[PDB]
Amino acid sequence: ATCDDGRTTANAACCILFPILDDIQENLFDGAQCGEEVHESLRLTFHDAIGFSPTLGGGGADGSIIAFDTIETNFPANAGIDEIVSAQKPFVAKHNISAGDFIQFAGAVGVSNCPGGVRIPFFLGRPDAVAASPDHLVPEPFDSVDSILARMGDAGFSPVEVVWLLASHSIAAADKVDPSIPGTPFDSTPGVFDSQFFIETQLKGRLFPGTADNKGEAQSPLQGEIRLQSDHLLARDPQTACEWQSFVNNQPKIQNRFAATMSKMALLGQDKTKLIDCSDVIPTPPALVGAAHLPAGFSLSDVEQACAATPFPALTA
Ligand code: HEM
Ligand SMILES: [Ca+2]
Numbered sequence: 001a002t003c004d005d006g007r008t009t010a011n012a013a014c015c016i017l018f019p020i021l022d023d024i025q026e027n028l029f030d031g032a033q034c035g036e037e038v039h040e041s042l043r044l045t046f047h048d049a050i051g052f053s054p055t056l057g058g059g060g061a062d063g064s065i066i067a068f069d070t071i072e073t074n075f076p077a078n079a080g081i082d083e084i085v086s087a088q089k090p091f092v093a094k095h096n097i098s099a100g101d102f103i104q105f106a107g108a109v110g111v112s113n114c115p116g117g118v119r120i121p122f123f124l125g126r127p128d129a130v131a132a133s134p135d136h137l138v139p140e141p142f143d144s145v146d147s148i149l150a151r152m153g154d155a156g157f158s159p160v161e162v163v164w165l166l167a168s169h170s171i172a173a174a175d176k177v178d179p180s181i182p183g184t185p186f187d188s189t190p191g192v193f194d195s196q197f198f199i200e201t202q203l204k205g206r207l208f209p210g211t212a213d214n215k216g217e218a219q220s221p222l223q224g225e226i227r228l229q230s231d232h233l234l235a236r237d238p239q240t241a242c243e244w245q246s247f248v249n250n251q252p253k254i255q256n257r258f259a260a261t262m263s264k265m266a267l268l269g270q271d272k273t274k275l276i277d278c279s280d281v282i283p284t285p286p287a288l289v290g291a292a293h294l295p296a297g298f299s300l301s302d303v304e305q306a307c308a309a310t311p312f313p314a315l316t317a
C-alpha cells in the first residue's frame, strides 16, 4: 500500500502510524536520538507488558501503565516510570492508537535509533486496557535469581529468554538505584545496542560509583558504570550464566533473540492473529562499527568466568 504522503507499507491499516512515527521521532525522542527518552520508553514496554499473571490477572502489553497510571506508578518497582508515562500520554491523547499499541510502537521506534539495534516486530490493534495490573508483578534488582526466574517464567519466559530480554540493559541507565548519581549506565556504551553489557557484568566488582549502601546494587567494575545485584547474580548463576556469556562478541545472536523475545513480550495478553503486522513501519537501525572488547587495561584475569561448558572468549582490551 502507498500512504497519503507516498510512503509505503505492506498493509494499508498501517499508514496511520507514519504521522505518529514522525511525531515521536521529533518530539519524544528529541530528533531520533538513542538517549534517555528511548531508554525510558524501552523500560516502559517491559513495565507495561510484565503486568501479566495467569493466577492474578493483568492484560500484559495493554497500555494499563498509562490508562491506570494512578495505580501502577504507586508500585515501588515502577519508581521513576511516571516521567515517561507523563511524556507519552499526550501522544496517546493526540493520535488515534491505543495506549498499548503506542507503548510498544514507541519502544520499537526508539530501539531503531540505536546503532547495532533491531526492528522489533510490531503489530497494530490492541484494545484499550480494561484492568490495572495486579501489584508485585515487576522484578526488582534486589530479587534473587530464583524469584526473578519464577516471575518471568509465570509470564511465559524461560531462563534463556530472560537473558535475551536483558540485552535491553545494553542501552540503559539508573536514576533511582543510587539517586546521588542519576543517569549512570549499565554498560560503557548506553547509546549503542551491543554486547558490552554482557562482557562488563562478568568483570570483578571493584567499587561503588556513588554511595555504598544502595539496595539492589552490586559493586561496579568501573567508575562510570553502575551494576544491579540482579545482573551481577544472573551473569553468575548456573541457570543463566552460559547463556549470558553466549552473547559476548555475538551480536547476531543478540539481534535475533532480542527482536523475537521483545515481540513475544509486546504480545503478552494479546493475540497476534487479531492484530495487523506493521513491522515494516519501524525505521532501519544503524549498524555497529567497533568490535566487542574488554575495557582497556582489563584482561581475562578480571573476568569471573561462570560457564563450566565454555571458556569466556578471548577478547582484546
Ligand atoms: C528481569 C529483571 C529486571 C530487573 C531486576 C531490572 C531492573 C532495572 C533497574 C533497577 C533499572 C534502573 C531503574 C532506575 O533506577 O532508574 C532498569 C532500567 C532499565 N530497564 Fe531493566 N530490569 C529487568 C528487566 C528488563 C527488561 C526485560 C527490559 C526490556 C525492555 C528492561 C529494560 C530497561 C531499560 C531500557 C532501562 C534503562 C532505563 C533508562 O535509562 O531510562 N529491563 N531496570
Ligand atoms: Ca500492562
Ligand SMILES: [Ca+2]
Binding pocket: 169, 170, 171, 187, 188, 189, 190, 191, 192, 193, 194, 195, 196, 197
Ligand atoms: Ca551498550
